[PDB]
Each structure stands twice: as C-alpha cells, then as structure tokens.
Design a binder for this molecule. Structure first.
Ligand SMILES: O=C1CC=C(OC(F)F)C=N1
Lengths: 245, 179
C-alpha cells in the first residue's frame, strides 16, 4: 500500500476517519451506511496489499535470489498477476469514488451516496467473467500451492532462509505464503456480507437500494459459479483417480 | 514459539466473527463492530508454553461446499460454535458441521462453544423463543451435544461482555498442543 491510502484508511471506522465537526452534520443512518462502505474499501486496500506481498516480496524475490526449477514459483503463486490486475483496478474505482466525494479544502471529509452502480459493473460483463475464470483456476490450485510450499520449506535450506528472512518483520506477522493463499481464497466470500450490511442502511434513496440489491444477486451468482468450477489439482495425480472422482 | 492454526465453524447466526474480533482486539468495539474478520496471529502463553495461534473464520462460506474446505488444511484446533439464543443452531451441529469437520480434519480436537451466554437471562430473547415453542439452550444440553459428537470439551462465553472469551482461546491453545 501507499502512505496516502494507508493514512486515509488508518481509522477503525468512517466516523473516526472524518473530522468530528463533519460527522456531527450527518444523520445516524448515513454514518452507519458510511462505516460499512469504509470497511469494504479498507479491506479491498488490504486484499490488494496481500497480492503485492505475493507478487513483489515472495514471487519476484524467489526468482531473483533462489535457484528453483521452472514452473515451481508459478505453482506456489498461481494467477497472482491476473488477481492483482482485477483487484487493483477495482480498488482504483473505489478510491476514485471517495476522492470525487471529498469536500473542497479537505482530504478526509466525504460521503459516498452511489456505490451500487460501481458494484454492478464490477460483478457483471467481461470483468465478472474474468473474476470467475481467475478464481476457479486459483481455488482449484490452492491445495497444490500449500503442499509445494511445505515440501520446499522442509527440504531446501536456501528457501527456508529466504522465507525466514522476508517474513521476519512484524508487519508480515499474519502474511506468510500459506496465509496469503487462504486470505485470497476467503476474499470473494466476504463480498455478500459487506454488501448486505451496506444495503441494510441504503433505503433512503430507492435507486440506491435497487442497485445494491442487483449487485448482491450478481456477487452470489459469481460465487455459485466459482464454487461449481472447483476441483483440487494434485501433484503427480493419475488419470484413473481423476475420472473415478 | 510454535505455530498453531485455529478455525471456527458454525451457522451464520452463531456469532463466530464477533468472538474472533473481540479476542483479537481484547474488546467489544465501542464505536463500530466490523462485518468481517480477515485473519490474526495471537501471541498466547498457556501453562508456560509460548504459541503463535493463527485465527481463521469460515463466515461467508456456509453456502459454498467446495470453497469452504480450503480453510481446513493443517488446522490444529476446531472451535465449533452455536448460539445459546438459537436452539436451531445447536441441532445443526451433529449431522451437518460434525461429519464435515471429522472428514477434512481427522483427529483434530473439536471444542463445542456456546456463544451469547448473556442472552440466557435476557427477557426479549425468552419472549421471542417462546413464540416458536422454544427456550434458550440449557447448560446440560450443550454438554450433552459436546459429549455426543466426541468433542474434546464444552465451553460457554459472551462476545458482548468478554466473559469466558480468553479461557476458550487458551484452552484451544492447549488442545492444539496435545498429540
Ligand atoms: O490480552 C488479551 C487479549 C485478549 C483476551 O481475551 C479477552 F478479550 F477476552 C485476553 N487478553
């Protein structure tokens, strides 16, 4: 993450991020809606950052410092470039929406009234097909990536020294290779929980309640589709074990 | 410190997310209760042993049968949650959550945790449940279900008041340390 965005999302809530004098001007229902909107964006910032640790710290670090066989780093970090693209673009759109909404003379006071349309666009058309295709491939290669990680840490000395070195700082406490992998797999199922609570506080404008309802149905269909496209790949699997599934 | 992994399971209304949030912060948030829990690595010292306990939630995965088991690999302790104001969440423990957890986590200690224990003496809770011929889960009913499903032990807590929360996680650390 970049310092600008980290400071903007350093607070535990939107009610603590904005100035007290700005907060005081809004109704309770608006504050509740804005706190859930803030959490969705703050966790998206964290998700993208999880993917940057995977691509820049782990993947590239192994390519430039370790002597691994071709196809090993890809096996440890499947679809990380595609996932980073999808989520960095979505985070760009969310952050731009907050930026447009800022009051003149302020880098922190804002109210996002129209999240529905952005969510319908992200979870529909070509971008939805790309998310479905990318997570169906990632989640099907999840167990293989963990087993491959465990095998390397226990048998390769330089790989063990590399992992211990790059994961030593405190800010990486909850971000080891396997932790990043589960963080990414769990991300998609977080969306309907956040969207439903945003919808719960978006009844004031009928068009907004409708767009959020549409977005919720779109997210659930994407999830149902990803879930039906999963079959765990296994290193050195036999054709017989596959067609007898 | 040794690394141990904990995963909490149970129905959406069981209060798993609130319990993980209150333990990771040592607080029931005064200003905003988060909708979701990402992950956390707790520094725990139980009976003189220092452990790094990684916490994971399954909330959101309840309807996705092929995404959900990807949270289970290498789990060391399972917290199986139900809500004391919801007798229906308890009935789902033996033939839905238990068969799944035993299959993907064979030989992993399960702790059955009765959440929202403060609602057992709440009048609004008692009035609502009485309309569907129901009452809050009794202490003996939780012990019996824990005994029946082969759980390592049975505990109760309130995420709201924090009572019993630290004990659950320290006991999960102990369960994760056993062989
Ligand atoms: O330092 C701590 C953190 C969390 C605890 O659990 C408590 F919140 F319930 C106890 N001591």
């Amino acid at each position: 993450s970049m310092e600008m965005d980290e400071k903007d999302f350093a607070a535990d809530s939107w009610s603590l991020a904005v100035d007290s004098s700005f907060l005081q001007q809004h109704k309770k229902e608006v504050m509740k809606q804005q706190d859930v909107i803030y959490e969705l964006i703050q966790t998206e910032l964290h998700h993208v950052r999880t993917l940057k640790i995977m691509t820049r710290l782990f993947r590239t670090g192994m390519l430039e410092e370790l002597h691994l066989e071709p196809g090993v780093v890809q096996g440890l970090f499947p679809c990380v470039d595609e996932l980073s693209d999808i989520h960095t673009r979505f985070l760009s759109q969310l952050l731009e929406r907050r930026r447009q909404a800022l009051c003149p003379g302020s880098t922190r006071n804002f109210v996002i009234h129209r999240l529905g349309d952005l969510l319908i666009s992200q979870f529909s058309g070509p971008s939805a097909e790309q998310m479905c295709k990318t997570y169906s491939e990632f989640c099907s290669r999840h167990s293989k990536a963990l087993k491959l990680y465990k095998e390397l840490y226990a048998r390769d000395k330089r790989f063990q020294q590399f992992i211990r070195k790059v994961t030593r700082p405190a800010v990486l406490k909850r971000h080891g290779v396997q932790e990043c992998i589960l963080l990414v797999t769990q991300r998609i199922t977080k969306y309907p929980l956040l969207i439903s609570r945003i919808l719960q506080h978006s009844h004031g404008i009928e068009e907004e309640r409708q767009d959020l309802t549409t977005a919720l149905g779109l997210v659930k269909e994407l999830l149902s589709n990803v879930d039906e496209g999963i079959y765990q790949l296994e290193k050195g699997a036999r054709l017989q074990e596959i067609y007898n599934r | 410190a040794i690394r141990k992994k904990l995963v909490i399971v149970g129905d959406g209304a069981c209060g798993k997310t609130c319990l993980l949030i209150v333990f990771s912060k040592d607080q029931f948030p005064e200003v905003y209760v988060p909708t979701v829990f990402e992950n956390y690595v707790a520094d725990i010292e139980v009976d003189g042993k220092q452990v790094e306990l990684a916490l994971w939630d399954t909330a959101g995965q309840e309807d996705y049968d092929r995404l959900r088991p990807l949270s289970y690999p290498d789990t060391d302790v399972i917290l199986m949650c139900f809500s004391i104001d919801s007798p229906d969440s308890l009935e789902n423990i033996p033939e839905k959550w238990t068969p799944e957890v035993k299959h993907f986590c064979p030989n992993v200690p399960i702790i059955l945790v009765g959440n929202k224990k403060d609602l057992r003496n709440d009048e609004h809770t008692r009035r609502e449940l009485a309309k569907m011929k129901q009452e809050p889960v009794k202490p003996e009913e939780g012990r019996d279900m824990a005994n029946r499903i082969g759980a390592f032990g049975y505990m109760e807590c309130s995420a709201k008041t924090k009572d019993g929360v630290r004990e659950v996680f320290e006991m999960a650390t102990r369960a994760a340390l056993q062989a």
